Structure formats: structure tokens, C-alpha cells
Amino acid sequence: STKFSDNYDVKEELGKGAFSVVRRCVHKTTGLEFAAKIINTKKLSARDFQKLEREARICRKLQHPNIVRLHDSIQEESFHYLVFDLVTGGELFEDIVAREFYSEADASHCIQQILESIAYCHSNGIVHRNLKPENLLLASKAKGAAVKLADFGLAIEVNDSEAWHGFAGTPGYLSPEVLKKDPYSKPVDIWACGVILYILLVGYPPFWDEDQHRLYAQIKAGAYDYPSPEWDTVTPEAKSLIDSMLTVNPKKRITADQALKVPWICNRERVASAIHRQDTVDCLKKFNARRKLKGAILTTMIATRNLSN
Amino acid sequence: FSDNYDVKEELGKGAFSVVRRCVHKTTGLEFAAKIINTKKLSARDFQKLEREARICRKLQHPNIVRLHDSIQEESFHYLVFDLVTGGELFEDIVAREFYSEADASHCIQQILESIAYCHSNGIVHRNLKPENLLLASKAKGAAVKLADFGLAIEVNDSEAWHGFAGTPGYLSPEVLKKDPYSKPVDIWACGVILYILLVGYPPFWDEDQHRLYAQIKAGAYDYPSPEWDTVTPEAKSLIDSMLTVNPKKRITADQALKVPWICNRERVASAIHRQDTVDCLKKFNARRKLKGAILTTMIATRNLSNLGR
8 A cells, every 4th residue: 555655754864773764754634743664675584574573563562652652554565664753852861961950759750651661561461671771762852751662672572471582682781580591571671670770870880890791690699789878868768669670589579560659659759859969960971971982882893894895 | 042943853963062953933944953062162162163153154055054043052052054864975876876977067066056156255165075065855856065164264365374174185285285275275175076976986095194195285196997997088177177286277166167067967977877986985985984983982982081080
């Protein structure tokens, strides 16, 4: 059919994916703007076609306000179009460092939205597997914009199955069960949520080591702490929530639904501290800068490979 | 700015600034806003920024990025330009099915018209290079636009040496000899670009800049066989008149626009497809993206260290 060409006006290119190009588009009737992932299905290899089918099915299931939603999936002659939310607010972590005031209450509001998106994924039998700063975006630059969970490239429909689904996810956010090659499921997203919450409170990660082997040993042992003096002003409730997420045995780890009912989340106005945390902002700026530098190094190596042939 | 525009998706990045699409609240008109962080700029730096704004506002031409407004707020400055979303010219050329001399001529004609306009207004760009040649959009027939007037100066009829500004591979002998220079430097750069547009590689290149600057001052370049054997003498003639060591003997933009290869490209410029040029241009762009990646890394390294101190 020609449902896309007749209903949408294609605008400028926003970027490129593994096997696609993304362009802004505007719905002719509603006038609403979206981000369209355009894929040439004929040229697609069999392997990538399978990846696409899985992506479209999973994204179709995930209809929640705190998730980068896929509006429509249209197949035309040789191209397929995946119409998604147009997210322009950038990384949550980059926005936080520009704030004049940032407190526990603000951290709680952020993690509450992330947990809502995760609880929704889990209720639909899907595990994201790649929660990290780069995938926590803001809908737009507008004040109060919603936190959006992005990139479901590694998501899988685990449902009620029991097995080890491989090593995927970023190294500082991986859970003990994945590293131990034990069966794992939805709880891995909660572990990552705990790592993110820790960073949201002090600006640096709980598991950190230049030696990858040491990092994984650290994670497997659940070896993190709350160093003075920065953590001396953090409430016991924030720490308790983190402890419930960074529980090594997945069977004793809190679920997203349960986390959303904890006072520090549900009654943040009273239970979460309202004090400004300048050191968190300062540390987070360095955390972001370090990530940007590693990313630039990676970009350079990829550029070197493209040149060399 | 914040009370009159709303920022949208990112269109690009660079030194201490990002370029994002923005929408004028009242009119609904779209523009490209260059957000510049000025928290560190000195009094003289701001003067240079106001210079760029002044120059751009003085330049209203169909082949030049048009500045709509210039606003300075708390810690940021905003330069609002028309939306230019076609990307870099060199990137678009390597994606064409057919690319001939006539196509290169059409590009050069547009670049010359933009330069002739600048020159007639007493302005010398000083930074004519690949990355500053953009296309209005992805549409066919999209006009070429001259961008980045960050180094442009109102030389008018004055004569003196204005410093070592610009990219080495495009620098003119006068500049390298520290002799007085003016509008002609843009013509020399245009000649280097024309040479690249025809075969895919630069006329002046070498390991160490010493020999590189040595061959430039001597105006020592060649038309190697077999690629140049299919290029018209008129194309080579125009290049020769642009790559003339003596500024006073170098062809002007107004003069170049009257050359048959330019004003009658349909007959004088070859129409044969130059696949070898497309292939070479791909490696040329790849090398360009690599250097850009190297620069980004150095910037990121500086940013991180700047925070530590």
C-alpha cells in the first residue's frame, strides 16, 4: 500500500541506524510530527530482516507515555516505515547538570518515570536489557518534559521462560545473574535501575573499575558502598530502595511494581530530601564528560576502520 | 530567544556550540539555531562574534546561508539561520548515480555567485572549503549554500596581511608568504575545490606541512594521467586561472562567471560519468570525517580536564 506517502510529509534526516535512515515527518491530517525510520526491505539481508520483524512486534506492544513509542509500521513497495515519537530533549543526565537546583526529590521523580516504563515492559513480558544513561531521554526541551526510555534493540519477549539469554547490555549496568551465566529475566532491568538511581543521587557509579574482570567480580559480589561525606546527607529511604534493587539474588530483588509503592517514590514530597546537591551536579558533569570522551574515541576508531579497506 | 523560539531536534555540532532546528512561536516559521555557549568568551571574542553577525546580516543571497536574527542572553548566544538540511555537497555527490563535469560546473557556478556577491560587498570569506558548502535540502536541484562566516572580514579596498586563517590545503601563496591579501584568496580556494570536484583528490598534499606549503607557494600541482585525460581543456584552464600564484593575475569571481565552461556548461562541460571521481571522493570524505573525529576527541579531552581544574 501507499499509506505512508499519502499520509506523511517527509522532512530532514535526523541520523542513521545499522540498516536505516531516520527522517522527521509530519502527519498531513493531524499535523503532528514524528521520527520515521526508513528501511529498504529488498536490500535487507535475511538476518537484518529478522531483527526488524522482532523490533516492530516488540515496539508495537510497548505503548506507554514514558517509552519512545512506535506510532505506525507501514510497508510500501520496497521500503518499510517505522513511525516513532520525535524525542528532542536529549539525555536526562545532560539536562540535570544544567539545573540550578537538584535534590533527592528530583531524583525520585526521575526514577519513578523510569520504573513506570519498566513496569509496563515487564507486565507485557518484555525485558529491555540495555538500561543506561544514553537510553534515558527527555521528550523535549520544555520544562517538565517526560523521561522517555529508548532503544529496544536488545529487548526480548522473555515472558515466563527460564534461561540465560546471552551476554548483552553495557558492562557497568550488567547484573550478577547475566555475568554468572545463570538464567535471567525481568529482574536484570531492576538491577540496572539501581545502578542508575545510585548515579542520580551522587553523580558517579556504584561499580567502577578500569579492569573489566575486576568490574565483573565487583558486580557479582554486589560490592558497592556509600562513601562519606556525600552519602551522609542522603536519606536511609533512598539507600534502602537502592539496596532492594542491587540485591545479588534476583529472587530477592524488588520488582518494578513493588518499587513504585515505596514511600520515597510515592510520597517523595515528604519522604525524599529537598536539599540541593551541588556535589552531585559537579560529579555528574565529570561523569558525562568521561562518557563523551570514550564515545569520541570510539567514533575515531570507527572512522579509522571506514577509511582503511 | 527563549520567549520567541522553541528548540527542536539537533541538526549538528561543533566547537562550543550546537545547531538545532527551532520554531518561531508567533509565525510558526522554522529555522536553524546555532547555540553558542559564551560563558568563557572575552570582550574581544564577543566582538568577533558580533562581526560574524554583522557580516551575515549584510549578506542576503540565494547561495549563502541567511541569518534571520542574532540574540545574546545570559550564558548563550543564538544565531538564527534559515533551515539548511541538505547536508554537505561532497556527501551528496558520492551518492549520485551519475556525476560529470557539467555537474561540477553547476556547483562551481553557484559557489562563484556566492563569492562574487561577498566580494562586491567588500567581504572576503577566507574559509571556503568542503565542510562549508551545503545543500538547501535533500530535494533534487537543491541550491548550494556557502556557510560559516566565522573568519570573514570586511576587507573592502584595503591592503595588508590579515594572518594565517583557514585550512592549510586551501591556503593561498600570498597568505603563506605573508604578503598582502584580499578577495583573491577565496578564488584560490575555489580553484582547489574545483580540482577536487573533478578527480576526487586535492592538487596540493604532502606528509609534512613544510613541503605542503612549499608546493603551494610555488603553485606546483599537476594533472596526472589517466584521470585527467578525459577532462576538458576549458576545465583545466579555469583551474589554472584560479590557481595563479600572483593575486593580481588571478581571475576574479565576476570574470570566472563569464567563462564558457561556466555560462554554457550544457555544451562546454563534458557530460560523461566520472566513476573514478566518485570513488576517490569517498576516500576523500572518509579522511575528512576521520580528522573531524580526531578533533572532536581533542575537544572532549580538553573539556574533561577543564572541569577537573
